[PDB]
Amino acid sequence: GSEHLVTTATFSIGSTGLVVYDYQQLLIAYKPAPGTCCYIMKIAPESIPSLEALTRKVHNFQMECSLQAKPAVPTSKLGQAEGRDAGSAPSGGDPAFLGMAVSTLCGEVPLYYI
Amino acid sequence: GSEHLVTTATFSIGSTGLVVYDYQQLLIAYKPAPGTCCYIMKIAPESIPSLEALTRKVHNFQMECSLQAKPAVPTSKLGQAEGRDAGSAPSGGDPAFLGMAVSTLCGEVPLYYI
Amino acid sequence: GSEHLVTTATFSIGSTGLVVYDYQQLLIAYKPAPGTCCYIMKIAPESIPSLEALTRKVHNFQMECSLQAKPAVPTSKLGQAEGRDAGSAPSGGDPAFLGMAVSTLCGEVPLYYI
């Protein structure tokens, strides 16, 4: 499926990976290899964190198809109910289906907030 | 000359070349070196073939300023009338002058369907 | 601060740097390293100088956080009043605050006409 939301600009980070910034819905696309795990985050219109800031947090590398303890799902000695689909995604309302662009780069993959 | 059609997003393929996807007119820009032969194709809104799919067909490399036997012009033991300008381009109606963006990347070069 | 102007396409030059062409206000984003000096120029709608042209003049490298004798400020044996903020920027009207996108890539850095 698809929708009518492809108004965003594509950018690159440093000299390795690349991420696109949504100048409207406030979304970003970040992923290691092509056709792999993806991640979406929110941005501020008062100060859009261009690649300059992105590369800063990206350098720390707290995902790599692993997802550090950033979200509510640390993935290490946790109760039954976890995050991702029960913590960082309140039903379909989750910011996972609010942009076609991100669906292209990420490849309609299950991305989680970072 | 130019027109009023620059609504598209630019993307990259793998870690070598890059191609832009037109989220409207359904067009794509693909080329080897800067200022060289170009190629335009159509895309589906139901499932836009992001770089993921592009790199797949691009990996096969069936052009390289040569154009394989993909189109109606195999370029090898064929009748008089050929393609390109007499097979893969029905007059000006050809999808060669329906986007300014592609005209920039391709460099207003005679691109043929792949 | 920010505004409502993010309608532009991002492109890359050669195989090192990258620049975004503003298909409207006629502006381009050029800079060496991420989060460093930036440069903005005007383009023509009749013949948008794609990366092909950019790389041409860019190859000469007449800036590098130095700015050659291109503008009115050669930076070498010149009168009191110089350019940049007194030659290549007529008050706030200067083409430095006419695009949010450029402000992102450049990082709200002081750019000078090249």
Side-chain angles (χ1 to χ4, degrees):
Chain A
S2 291
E3 310 203 351
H4 187 47
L5 300 172
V6 305
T7 170
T8 169
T10 78
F11 303 106
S12 97
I13 48 183
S15 333
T16 49
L18 125 160
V19 307
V20 306
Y21 299 140
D22 227 280
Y23 284 127
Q24 171 130 289
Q25 201 92 30
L26 270 45
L27 276 311
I28 311 92
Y30 170 93
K31 57 100 202 72
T36 73
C37 312
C38 208
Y39 310 87
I40 211 97
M41 53 221 112
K42 236 71 204 281
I43 40 139
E46 70 224 327
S47 262
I48 304 284
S50 107
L51 40 137
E52 305 334 307
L54 240 290
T55 67
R56 230 287 291 197
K57 166 257 267 52
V58 163
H59 185 221
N60 265 39
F61 289 134
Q62 309 229 281
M63 24 270 213
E64 205 103 76
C65 277
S66 222
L67 238 187
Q68 223 81 285
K70 258 119 67 102
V73 46
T75 328
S76 146
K77 186 243 204 119
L78 79 113
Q80 293 136 105
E82 317 109 38
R84 320 110 127 286
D85 235 70
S88 223
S91 312
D94 172 281
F97 313 100
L98 76 172
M100 229 313 301
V102 295
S103 140
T104 348
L105 315 119
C106 301
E108 283 270 321
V109 307
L111 57 83
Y112 315 116
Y113 256 40
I114 56 179
Chain B
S2 292
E3 310 203 351
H4 186 47
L5 299 172
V6 305
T7 170
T8 169
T10 78
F11 301 107
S12 97
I13 49 184
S15 333
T16 49
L18 126 159
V19 308
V20 307
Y21 297 141
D22 228 280
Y23 286 126
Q24 171 129 288
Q25 201 93 30
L26 270 45
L27 276 311
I28 312 93
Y30 169 93
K31 56 100 202 72
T36 73
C37 311
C38 208
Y39 310 87
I40 211 98
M41 53 221 113
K42 236 70 203 281
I43 40 139
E46 68 225 327
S47 261
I48 303 286
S50 106
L51 41 138
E52 301 322 314
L54 242 289
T55 68
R56 229 286 292 198
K57 166 257 267 51
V58 163
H59 183 221
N60 264 39
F61 289 131
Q62 312 227 280
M63 24 270 214
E64 207 104 77
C65 278
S66 222
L67 238 188
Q68 223 82 285
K70 259 118 67 102
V73 47
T75 327
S76 146
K77 186 243 204 120
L78 80 113
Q80 293 136 105
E82 317 109 39
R84 321 110 126 286
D85 235 71
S88 223
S91 312
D94 172 281
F97 313 100
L98 76 173
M100 229 313 301
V102 295
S103 140
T104 347
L105 314 119
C106 301
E108 281 270 321
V109 307
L111 57 82
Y112 316 116
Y113 256 40
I114 56 179
Chain C
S2 292
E3 310 203 350
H4 187 47
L5 299 172
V6 307
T7 170
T8 170
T10 79
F11 300 106
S12 103
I13 48 186
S15 333
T16 49
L18 122 163
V19 315
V20 309
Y21 297 142
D22 225 280
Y23 285 124
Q24 172 130 288
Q25 203 92 30
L26 275 27
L27 278 315
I28 310 101
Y30 178 96
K31 56 99 203 72
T36 73
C37 314
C38 209
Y39 309 83
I40 209 103
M41 53 221 112
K42 236 72 201 280
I43 41 138
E46 68 223 327
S47 262
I48 304 285
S50 106
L51 39 136
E52 302 322 314
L54 239 292
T55 69
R56 231 288 292 197
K57 163 259 267 52
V58 162
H59 180 221
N60 264 39
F61 288 135
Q62 315 226 281
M63 24 270 219
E64 208 105 76
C65 276
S66 223
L67 232 190
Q68 223 82 285
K70 261 117 67 102
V73 54
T75 328
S76 146
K77 187 242 204 119
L78 78 114
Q80 294 135 106
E82 317 109 38
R84 321 110 126 286
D85 234 70
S88 223
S91 312
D94 172 281
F97 312 99
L98 76 177
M100 228 314 301
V102 295
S103 141
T104 347
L105 315 113
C106 303
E108 283 271 321
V109 300
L111 59 78
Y112 310 119
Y113 254 40
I114 56 180

